[PDB]
Symmetry: D2
């Protein structure tokens, strides 16, 4: 991982570890913008489709007029570490920030940043 | 009429949606008040898979800050649409996660008014 | 009191959920009535990404049958939970796609009653 | 594809072509259960997360106590043909029917059945 990738992991980790343990708010995300800012958020769990942390990040970035996001990561509570984006988040990320990379674990459990398109092969169009 | 703090929510959400490019994806801003005095903002993320409304982005932003219970929320539309009542999905999430919250809606006169979330979902479904 | 058709909806949704294995993923059934008199049923698909409630599965089932306008809907929970009021998300989709629809809910005395969808979303969201 | 798989495409195509053209009801899906039954459905578009056709199929199959679904396909209206499942559907399919395959188009535009895990690499 690059310096900025490690930094996103640290920011997301600090975010989730800094709030009370909760079944409603259990994952944090951090993303980097092309204009030199970092946005965080936590999920809102709900059966009607409450947003993942990544989507909260996207809305937070949009509220700040941070156009292009270039890298994103999700970190689970209780020291779970890096979580790969769920399929819903992958679709929203592909559609709204097609240039973005997401930090996921490789087969060795080692963090790596992968282009969003690679996380949705034979993508829906 | 509205309390001072309630008016501040309308101001803040109006500033937010007037501070971002006009967009079909990012078209509504929201602001909520915590019992701790802080205000949290958010903009929606439109998507057919169920991208969050602005209110849900606010909820996640407040949660990220370990906010004290939220007491009031408002949504403000782009293109100068003004106050928008929360959609049914947002109403359900607010009822379930912040049952004490009020939402700012327009009365009969088009005048801002704070209403308990329960009033916005009569015979409310209870997520157990 | 409910019409014959409305009672039939309750019976059909109840039969549907009672007929399947108890499950955390599939835990509510719904039945709706179309203006032409047909009945469509469905069960929910629970998922954190926003899997559909039974009502929405019923909407897609009716749509697959070119059912047109739906006039009444009800949801019934598993394990003899009985009538459940539609959640806020279902209310919004129902109002938007079938504005003429009523939902069966329990009134303040616990008695089934058919209510216009608009009444279930006061000061509703309009674009 | 196998003949059972080809039938899914036929059934989903018939379903979407049988209904009035609509912006709300625009995709049909068909799935095969382990015992050979076929279940169909159409989407319900809504900004709050109305279900894709696949999820309607999942609830339809569940209503019939179908158990495991082994194959699924989505067909777009207006002769759009096979549509790869979106990321949301991929996630639900993975979680509720991990043994399932989805029919997608290959490089030559020809139908191919792919395991759901391959459609969500490094899957959550
Ligand atoms: C890694 As996730 C559950 O926030 O899509
Ligand atoms: C007023 As709304 C579309 O953010 O629920
Ligand atoms: C009564 As319901 C959880 O199907 O909206
Ligand atoms: C191919 As789709 C829009 O039903 O996931
Ligand atoms: Cl959703
Ligand atoms: Zn996600
Ligand atoms: Zn909403
Ligand atoms: Zn519902
Ligand atoms: Zn889909």
């Amino acid at each position: 991982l690059s310096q900025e990738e490690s930094t996103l992991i640290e920011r997301a980790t600090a975010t989730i570890n800094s709030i009370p343990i909760s079944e409603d708010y259990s994952v944090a995300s951090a993303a980097l913008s092309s204009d030199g800012r970092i946005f965080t958020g936590v999920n809102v769990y709900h059966f009607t489709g409450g947003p993942c942390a990544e989507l909260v990040v996207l809305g937070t970035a949009a509220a700040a007029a941070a156009g292009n996001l270039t890298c994103i990561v999700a970190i689970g509570n209780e020291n779970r570490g890096i979580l790969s984006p769920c399929g819903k988040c992958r679709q929203v990320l592909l559609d709204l920030h097609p240039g973005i990379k997401a930090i996921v674990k490789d087969s060795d459990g080692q963090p790596t940043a992968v282009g969003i398109r690679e996380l949705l092969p034979s993508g829906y169009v």
